[PDB]
Amino acid sequence: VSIKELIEKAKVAQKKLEAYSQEQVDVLVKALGKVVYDNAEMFAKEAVEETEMGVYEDKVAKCHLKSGAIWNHIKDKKTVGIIKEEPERALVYVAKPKGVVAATTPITNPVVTPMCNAMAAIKGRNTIIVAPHPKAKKVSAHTVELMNAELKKLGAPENIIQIVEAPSREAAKELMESADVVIATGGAGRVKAAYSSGRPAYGVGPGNSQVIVDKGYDYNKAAQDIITGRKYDNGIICSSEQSVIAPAEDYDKVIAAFVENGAFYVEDEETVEKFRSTLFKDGKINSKIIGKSVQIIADLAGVKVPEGTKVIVLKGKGAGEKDVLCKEKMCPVLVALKYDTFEEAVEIAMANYMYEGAGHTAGIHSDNDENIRYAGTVLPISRLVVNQPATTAGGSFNNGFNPTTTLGCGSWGRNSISENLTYEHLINVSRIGYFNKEAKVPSYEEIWG
Amino acid sequence: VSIKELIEKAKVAQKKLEAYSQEQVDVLVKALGKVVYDNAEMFAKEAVEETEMGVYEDKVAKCHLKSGAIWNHIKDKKTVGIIKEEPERALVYVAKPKGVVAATTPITNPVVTPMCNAMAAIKGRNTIIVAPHPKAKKVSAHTVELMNAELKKLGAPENIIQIVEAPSREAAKELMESADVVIATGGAGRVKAAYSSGRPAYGVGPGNSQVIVDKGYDYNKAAQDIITGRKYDNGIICSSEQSVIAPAEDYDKVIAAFVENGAFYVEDEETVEKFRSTLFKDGKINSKIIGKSVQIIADLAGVKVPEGTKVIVLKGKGAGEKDVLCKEKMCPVLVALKYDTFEEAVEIAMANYMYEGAGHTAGIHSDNDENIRYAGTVLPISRLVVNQPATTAGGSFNNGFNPTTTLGCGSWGRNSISENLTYEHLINVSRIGYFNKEAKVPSYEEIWG
């Protein structure tokens, strides 16, 4: 099945799907997330043992959280036909499909990403063609199979969800250039290909979530939240915490709070280098430790780490490019940096985002809202996460971030949107704009007064 | 001055401009539009006589309308720092610059487009580098010169607005690939280059505004509005009317209303072909008649057209690809098509958008709001214009369309947005997202009930 065949099958199905009503669309979208929720144990076991990375229980919770939070958010959203009337502007808003969606899915979330993109596309009467990551093509195609089985039970049009099993680089390039809109969730090489296809694209970016712990905050609570997000799925989540920027006044208190909650702190220079020379090879992350457990990393580094350790905290030689450990670490390892005062703490996180990860996510644990707002104003980020694990940046029942699996990084990460990808970005919103007669034309003084 | 120098000067100026407040930004933006308003007579005379297309008085009104309507819309908009608080979602919205903007400007609007893009960029503390069309580089650089003169009077940072005078295709390609965000207002070749640069881009599309006149409407009013938009600037406006889809019941009444208001109607097959073989060469528009007067087109066609004629109405052989006249005509010429009933009138316009211009603008003249809403729901357009000239789709004091010079065509025209380009698209909007504790976690029945 060539790409031109997949595109033609998707365009035919979309024209059939365009005749669907708001209710008939929502029926299909709800079942897409429910089948991922009901088969979470099977998908998580296959994804972990095929991609050779991640934690089984964490992917089960990921399938449960993503599928439920997405449908809970989009169940009452109007995305078909006329959706909003603004008489004060003499405007009527109409929601129209964009057409055929091409979605390249990653290896880290090979189940919830094909689900999220398909739910967001079908929500706006669009069809989707999935191109999975090669090391995850089996579990990603199995998710599409279980989703298409439920769509067939509901009499949905065939081929509204398609899969490109094992495509070449030219095939994925042929797919993105042929589709009406592109979604690229993965490495910077796949994202740059999306914005080079001559088509409007939605991409992601490399993460590097910096975490500021403010003076006086509950260090035990901050430690628990940061450890929970760092070890989540063995640390392959893009928004996962990467550093702990702690005040030098209470530095021993912050570290002891991490050690109390299952962290192994390393201060010795030679011992940290045993981890640094293992995690990074010529400034690049070692692919053999991506998504691996703490004991796997500890054995390869030759350092004794006690059993039950959740994360590894390493004292960094400095901020920014003073230490390769300040880059994105796709493994349960945190770099520890001390700061003098808050503006410098913002500067320390600023230098790490210039090193890698600008435009993604940051985390802060503080009761000082003047400090939280100052951090949110200066840092080059799309999402600031306050007093909770940074891994919740993709949507939670306790925060206001839009649930998604595609976190846009804005212009910093070379993306079109600096927000979470939802149904909104997969529909064209038009305007009917009437002739407002009651409005008075401003004069020269009324314009430039 | 190489492109790498222009980028470095723009990045330095943007970091200086980022320190500006909301008030200090609005001061610069107001002066950018005012200097184009105050020098409209000089800019319009130079643009007409350099690009060899358009009408002098129409470009004066264009400079007056665009500059005033844009500032009147963005004067009170918050685009610096924290701009919105949503306590019901525990969200705080922050507006951040995207960086350096690369804007390729067209030959048809070489004055208001460099102004609009610069006003929208500086509104969000961004800097802009303008790459003008070769046949309009003198008047486009003169606009940048007069704008930078006013910025210098106000002590603004130098080089927040730059110009690439006469760049090669490789130079414009080097500029778009180097900037943080791209704006491409021009032909489909320049737009496709923007979305192929590996950067997030905002483009336009070829227009082909179809106009439906409903049964029973004021045919004299519809004729006046359609003629006004067709002859505007000798018909080079992208949203300008291209056809008159009239009911066959009152076809003679609609045509007589056009003739009464200064139109020359042609019904003879051989005489229409004299125009068709002149307007189009092998299906492509003849560049010698783009933006030219009615008498210029009439002389080249060898057809006697009376003096004082405003537009030329040509009876088409059929809808869609049955007549090359149903394509975009960048000249004061309309194609006339009769329809049986309203659903077919929507189908006739549908076939012309499939031929050319899908995703742009349509016009309708009707008192039946059920028909207006049916047309707005089905037609593949970003803007429907009701009971007024379609050239007002770029913003008017009597409609709710956002004032702009960059009209996005959505996924149909291979653009990222299906709306008018404003300050909103040139800023990154981030979220601070607090931890909502009062929210209750839904259970299985509460999620999938």
UniProtKB/Swiss-Prot annotation, chains A, B:
Subunit structure: Homodimer.
InterPro entries found in the cross-reference section: Ald_DH/histidinol_DH, Ald_DH_C, Ald_DH_N, Aldehyde_DH_dom
Entry keyword Cytoplasm: no
Protein's name in the database: Succinate-semialdehyde dehydrogenase (acetylating)
Catalysis: reaction(s): succinate semialdehyde + NADP(+) + CoA = succinyl-CoA + NADPH + H(+)
Taxonomy of the source species: Bacteria, Bacillati, Bacillota, Clostridia, Eubacteriales
SUPFAM superfamilies attached to this UniProt entry: ALDH-like
Encoding gene (name): sucD
Keyword NADP tagged: yes
Keywords: NADP, Oxidoreductase
Membrane-spanning ranges: none
Active site per UniProt: C238
Residues noted as binding NADP(+) in the record, renumbered to the chain: A184, T185, G186, G187, A188, G189
Pfam families: Aldedh
GO molecular function: oxidoreductase activity, acting on the aldehyde or oxo group of donors, NAD or NADP as acceptor
Main function: Catalyzes the reduction of succinate semialdehyde to succinyl-CoA. The enzyme is specific for succinate semialdehyde and succinyl-CoA, and only shows low activity with palmitoyl-CoA. There is no activity with NAD(+) as cosubstrate.
Activity across pH: Optimum pH is 7.0 for the reduction reaction and 8.5 for the oxidation reaction.
EC number assigned by the record: 1.2.1.76
